[PDB]
């Protein structure tokens, strides 16, 4: 029987929340299509880091990618609202928003930019790490040189803390931290652990300053050529991928502080979040003007 082999990649390790996502997706696609579609999985930025990969999928040089929302505004501007600091109360809030009508509407914004966005998934809440000093209050961030993703909302937000930002593809981060080009970076525990950033970062604070969604993306032309039953199979495979992805994030978050302490990191997990929110007031006010009160309240009031 005719079979098609496609490729999907991530910037992170096979042994991570995102590796679980794409391995689960590949297994489900094969099962739900009775072997007529197979998906080869690639890790650690093989086939490109996130921005390059989203571009590649748009071009069609490979078929699929799983990416955080970080580089997405370079392609689909509507997702920026999700990247606002301190927008989501907790993972349940974020997941409910993305799975429900608000997130579905955002998926439709990908169609006109040459993707099928199969499903929302999760990277996690992001936390600040660095080599220089323990961060116990927002003032401790001032002057730190921090790598960021290629995301305009994060860059503006972190400048609000007095951080000196440098956007970089994820594939360059470990080496930049090791060499001291930047003092630090920010990422969920799922990434910090799987990327072994404990080896090149002494300090971590659970600032939880933004929620980082992720997405399964497919080249639109390729998706549209799938038979209808197979389109449905790919969507359902992605949703199952998101389920196991989120479960792994939950496990990582539950055990991660003890794990990273055992590995030698000084992890500050007791901070006054209100103080960090207050520090961003000027930039918060700009985001409120940018996205509008209705859209931000629509998300904040979701339950
Ligand atoms: O820091 C980043 O670039 C991302 O969190 C990473 O590629 C996983 O999605």
UniProtKB/Swiss-Prot annotation:
Q: Which UniProt keywords apply?
A: Periplasm, Signal, Transport
Q: Which InterPro entries does the protein's record reference?
A: DctP_fam, TRAP_DctP, TRAP_DctP_sf
Extract the GO molecular function terms from the UniProt entry: carbohydrate binding
Q: Which GO terms describe its cellular component?
A: outer membrane-bounded periplasmic space
Tell me where in or outside the cell this protein is found.
Answer: Periplasm
Residues noted as binding (R)-pantoate in the record, renumbered to the chain: 18, 50, 123-126, 147, 187
Please list the GO biological process terms of this entry: transmembrane transport
Q: What is the first-listed, main subcellular location in coarse terms?
A: periplasm
Asked if Transport is a keyword of the record, the answer is: yes
**CDD domains according to UniProt:** PBP2_TRAP_SBP_like_5
Tell me the function of this protein.
Answer: Solute-binding protein that binds (R)-pantoate and D-erythronate (in vitro). Probably part of a tripartite ATP-independent periplasmic (TRAP) transport system that mediates solute transport into the cytoplasm.
How does the record describe its quaternary structure?
A: The complex is comprised of an extracytoplasmic solute-binding protein and a heteromeric permease formed by two transmembrane proteins.
Q: Which family does it belong to?
A: Belongs to the bacterial solute-binding protein 7 family.
Name of the molecule in the record: Solute-binding protein Veis_3954
């Amino acid at each position: 029987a005719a079979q098609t082999t496609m490729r999907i990649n991530i910037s992170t390790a096979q042994n991570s929340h995102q590796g679980v996502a794409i391995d689960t997706f590949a297994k489900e696609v094969e099962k739900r299509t009775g072997g007529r579609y197979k998906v080869q999985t690639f890790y650690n930025a093989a086939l490109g880091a996130e921005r390059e990969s989203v571009e590649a999928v748009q071009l069609g040089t490979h078929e699929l990618t799983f990416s955080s929302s970080g580089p997405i505004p370079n392609f689909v501007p509507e997702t920026k609202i999700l990247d606002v600091p301190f927008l989501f109360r907790d993972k349940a809030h974020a997941r409910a928003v993305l799975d429900g009508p608000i997130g579905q509407e955002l998926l439709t914004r990908f169609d006109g930019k040459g993707f099928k966005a199969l499903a929302w998934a999760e990277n996690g809440f992001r936390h600040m790490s660095n080599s220089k000093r323990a961060v116990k209050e927002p003032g401790d961030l001032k002057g730190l040189k921090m790598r960021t993703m290629e995301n305009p909302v994060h860059i503006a937000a972190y400048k609000g803390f007095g951080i000196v930002t440098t956007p970089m593809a994820f594939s360059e981060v470990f080496t930049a931290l090791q060499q001291g080009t930047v003092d630090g970076q920010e990422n969920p525990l799922s990434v910090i652990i799987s990327a072994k950033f404990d080896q090149v970062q002494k300090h971590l604070t659970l600032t939880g300053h933004v929620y980082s969604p992720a997405l399964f993306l497919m080249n639109k032309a390729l998706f549209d050529k799938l038979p209808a039953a197979d389109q449905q199979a790919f969507i359902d495979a992605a949703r199952q991928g998101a389920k196991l992805n989120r479960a792994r994030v939950d496990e990582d978050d539950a055990k991660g502080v003890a794990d990273l302490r055992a590995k030698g990191m000084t992890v500050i997990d007791n901070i006054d979040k209100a103080r960090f929110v207050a520090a961003l007031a000027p930039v918060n006010a700009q985001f409120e003007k940018q996205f509008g009160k209705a859209a931000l309240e629509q998300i904040r009031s979701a339950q």
